[PDB]
Symmetry: D2
Subunit: 385 residues, 4 copies
């Protein structure tokens, strides 16, 4: 398969597997085997030996996501968090420093601030939407600039190409967590990022039924260290999960186009309502970084955050008033979800500059019919009065 | 379910799940969901929120293995290696020291020696079968004594109770990797170990189809830190894998009794043959530590290692001559396997005191009929001449 | 959930399952259990006893497809064929008669003609696109008129409402095999059909990884007999397959809209090429029954058949020349497929009026990028010269 | 693999699959694909085309069970009932007759008596333990003698060889439903049966998590008709279920030996108690047909039925008093179950000669520790007083 000559929807179905030369099954077989027979000691039959070191069903997934990012290399992990931990352990050692943003998944922040600081790593938080702030925070020991764009949950936007330029003449690498945009909307390697991280739990799987992570790169050395760590630390996905993830990925383009259609309409409806003080959606002209988003994103995504004029009580009542959109953690599935980040996904950021306003609700707009989602949002807003 | 009043086979089926109060399915449902609806923000319906932080199908497995070890607490991970890495990160920090044995899974050693030494951890290798050697190696900064018994691949034996006594008056914890014995043959917590590790990839799953790890303890603080890390680093098992693992575990006693029946007979047959210089099997009277094994193990296991009088060429030819026993990595499945550790599972120990003799073959004796396994071993031995 | 007030995409995600009142998982749990504990003899805990008689994971699927058809009742089976066999056995007995069309899945025809005629059932084949031909073939013993529209493989069109009117004053029931249109494009119960059949193997699952069938109706007596036969003959789906099918169904609308976008463009391109004698696609103005299709179908589907001016040799060479579209049986998956019906899916119709022209290729247009599918078709057409 | 030279436990692991010549996975891959690429129209790559007509994962299972029965041929189905229905449809036509026993699975009886009699088939019920009664019931139109031994639920015993001799000079075939004995305890083809049926739902799977059926034979014509019907009627198993079934089958010998150990001890304990009027267990010297069972069965099985001196009230109270043995339908899993057949599995036999005494409880003795099962039975018996 050649990624450079085929479209995204084509690649999402065909980049990882073609019907094999044995039976020719249309889909990758599920190789639920921990081991593989060898033809003689350490002479492998067809490249595989032990599933923690490699399995074809997992490699199919890896190759697919790599192709969708414009990447030669990809490696999969048991979760987005485990992928982040492995990338941290490759890039950093005691005495090194990270530049991190001021709006970010609470789990990323918790890992740095609770775990990696106990192992000798330093960090600085900055507003990554201000290129000069990032530039000022880079020290001689900075090995990593960690960017999420759009950020979770406020949907803040960073200019990837501009921040990548800052790493020239330095030993810093730029890693973009591309979970919210997905590879369908944004390809950070093409703008100068060194590596890209995904939680495949979210949009790539798309069906809220498999936890997973994945790292992609064009750096063969980085691919070798990801493989070394995949096998040597062992946070590897199940073959069943890697099959389910890849299955979901086959509909990413059609899903995301509907998520973005729906979110544009719900954001416009929220922006007309006096219960709402602020709609956070990258496609709105006044959203901070809108012009950066429109240059680097194909569309503006399925996520919306909303700040309520009636404060935390209104935010929480909105959370318990919806009847189609479900109150739950996570995002990026076909079903619509909502949550209150200050008490739920980002309770771990309390006390830090990443702490989220208590009047804020984060909504993952699914692929249900827009008329039904508009009706549910409207009735929930009317339940506040 | 009460573990203290029921037998091992009973617990292996019933300690993790009883038919629920909703539908009453005989087996734990497979909760292939990343998230769970809440009744209000951060008010959970029945204890679950997000699968990386907890899922009922995974907790069923955890509770089952905990009960089989005489443990109050258990936590599952994506692999034996990932479980080891998490336990290392809980117990150690920069500046701390580990005492490790001289025969051990090459992956354990690689993790310490390549990764943890780069993060400021020190270690010392000793022969853990010599209690005085362990005692001498404990320093004021020793936080961990890591014991495997029987060891992989030489089946060396450590006196768990004796080594546990060494940790009194110290800040060292004893962790036993109980993979080879399984909880059916040996219960290190009852002899004073602080925690127990398993690769469930091996005997606990038993069917060579799921990679997994698990840690058990009676220390509630340790359970809290395992949970924190499970969720915060995220090397969590798939729900499908945790179901398959627990499914396999339901036959552990009946499997292991057949593995041990078969291995006793194959070890006796090997001990009569002049092609063999040494049979390594804990149940043989001259195996080093046999008397220690007979005190702390119910039976002597399914693993045998063999050293060939004709050296490496004979070891490798034996590997390619068997027709029922398969040449492959791994162990503890219903099918019989064999491998050459110096070139395969322990190639990573080359150069170290853990390096394995090149004349050594490690055999995982399965549950096939003994007459057929004896016939296969006999014909393979006759192929050397 | 109320189907009558929510949209198709909403229903496809939410009509079968809402997060339960036990744990609240976002998705239906996989109840991989053959049996369920009872509270006393034949006093069920929550409606379930034995999976062949009923399982919640299967009922979730059933309820979802029923809602998408405007049906109160649905029952699932191991395959489209097994669903057809069960419906035949309910509606017919020895001495009864069926009216069948002249273009139909070869397996339907084989079942009638090889099996049911040996059990005393009679049939007549007619062109169901000619309402008067159907009317003339109805006898006093006719219990079933079996309609496929569009037909497999020629995409012939039947006026469902008109044929349903013919059953007034008779003991005949109209059953529509709605596999090719799916419930997203066509709802035969709303036009007077008595029951609707699907092979969920095709579009409803959508991922070419699960074989299944399903029958929907508004007749409660028919639902009772489908249940009786589901449990009493036992062609029941696996719980894993019913979960996978329902998972796929969550993207039916977004998939089908892309399949129809793509097929409209490929049909137009084929209609411009002199290698092609006839393009069979319901959306073309000259396709027989186009006006009937436009009244009863929302869009015209993802399937195209093509007859080649160079006869069978050209049809077969086209089959082996495509490099993205794969030569294989089946249809309705995200990947594009093609086949030669005379030698493959319809070889069983040889000798009958259903026999398919040897110059005919049937194409299942997937959801790949149109530019890549156009390029593949164009290069394959150029390989004929 | 050669079945004739290897033992049962060997075959149960190795008769269906050997590590392939492509990747060499230790276990059969799960081919979750409905279709397979062809090299040209109707030129298959490696024997497979469409999963309803054949799939390698299903064929692995089929070949395994065939080998365990001493059979050249095997074909799998979605349930035991669907397998029975297919075998009925092959062997019988309108006007033919069946000889059936007087104690039999209620579902078998329901299928004959409700469905097949409506299609022109006749039957006669006899006591199949009386060879002369079977002989007398054979007519010129008899095509099938259907034997279960031991019977469900009374554990009645039929002399297979003797009944097979009755079919000489006739057009009758003997089919044995070998579900309760399993192939580990009894091999009816070796005693003259024409075909053997299993519900793999029970012992062969062994884990109460997969519904399935299977038919084995040495008649190649019968294998061709089973294949024809498998594909043409389509009651085919899921690939996931066929993998799970075969996984379970790998421990059949070790499971069954423990089930039989346990059942012998529970039957002896029940036979000492005055609450019990009759213990039905084939290994008891006074059980009718004990001497026949000891000739044709390796051991006497895991099932026990019990008739209570205090009648139906005592039978039902025993059912609700056990705390380890669970009240549920089904049998042959690792967990112990019990049920009241008159109200549960055999309510469908009410009114017929197959109707089961209301004082009768059927117990599926699992593989839990005997001390715990004895304790549970003893306490439940003491709850009657
Ligand atoms: C959810 C999420 C993660 C963590 O991924 P998991 O798969 O839940 O471990 C990381 N980054 C972002 C932006 C996320 O939303
Ligand atoms: C295999 C093994 C491990 C590693 O477990 P994985 O599940 O392969 O990561 C650890 N300890 C021992 C003794 C082992 O044999
Ligand atoms: C494929 C198909 C069937 C048969 O369904 P299976 O799931 O393959 O048994 C029936 N009807 C039509 C129109 C089909 O294309
Ligand atoms: C359970 C059983 C059957 C029916 O099998 P299913 O898999 O439940 O359809 C047939 N025969 C006997 C003896 C059984 O116990
Ligand atoms: Mg990129
Ligand atoms: Mg939640
Ligand atoms: Mg212990
Ligand atoms: Mg190997
Ligand atoms: Mg309809
Ligand atoms: Mg094919
Ligand atoms: Mg037999
Ligand atoms: Mg029940």
């Amino acid at each position: 398969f050649d990624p450079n000559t085929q479209g995204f929807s084509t690649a999402s179905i065909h980049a990882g597997y073609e019907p094999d030369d044995y039976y020719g099954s249309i889909n990758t077989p599920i190789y639920a085997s921990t081991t593989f027979a060898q033809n003689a000691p350490n002479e492998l039959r067809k490249g595989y030996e032990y599933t923690r070191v490699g399995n074809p069903t997992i490699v199919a997934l890896e190759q697919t996501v790599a192709a969708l990012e414009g990447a030669k290399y990809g490696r999969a992990f048991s979760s987005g968090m485990a992928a982040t931990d492995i990338l941290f352990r490759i890039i950093l050692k005691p005495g090194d420093h990270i530049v991190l943003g001021n709006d970010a998944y609470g789990g990323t922040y918790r890992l740095i601030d609770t775990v990696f600081t106990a192992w000798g790593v330093e960090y600085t938080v900055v507003d990554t939407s201000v290129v000069e702030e990032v530039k000022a925070a880079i020290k001689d020991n900075t090995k990593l600039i960690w960017v999420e764009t759009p950020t979770n949950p406020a949907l803040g936007i960073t200019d990837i190409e501009a921040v990548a330029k800052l790493t020239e003449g330095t030993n810093a690498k730029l890693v973009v967590d591309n979970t919210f945009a997905s590879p369908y909307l944004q390809q950070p390697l093409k703008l100068g990022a060194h590596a890209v991280l995904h939680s495949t739990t979210k949009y790539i799987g798309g069906h809220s039924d498999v936890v997973g992570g994945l790292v992609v790169t064009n750096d063969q050395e980085m691919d070798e260290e990801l493989l070394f760590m995949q096998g040597g630390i062992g946070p590897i996905p199940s073959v069943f999960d890697a099959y389910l993830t890849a299955r979901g990925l086959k509909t990413l383009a059609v899903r995301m186009d509907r998520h973005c259609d729906n979110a544009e309409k719900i954001a416009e409806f929220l922006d007309s309502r006096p219960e709402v003080s602020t709609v956070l959606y990258p496609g709105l002209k006044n959203h901070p970084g809108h012009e950066v988003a429109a240059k680097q994103m194909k569309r503006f995504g399925g996520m919306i955050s909303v700040r309520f004029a009636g404060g935390e009580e209104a935010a929480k009542k909105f959370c318990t008033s919806t009847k189609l959109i479900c109150l739950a953690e996570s995002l990026g599935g076909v079903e619509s979800l909502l949550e209150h980040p200050a008490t739920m996904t980002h309770q771990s950021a309390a006390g830090s500059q990443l702490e989220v306003p208590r009047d804020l609700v984060r909504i993952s707009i699914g692929i249900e019919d827009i008329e039904d989602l508009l009706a549910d949002v409207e009735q929930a807003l009317n339940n506040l009065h």
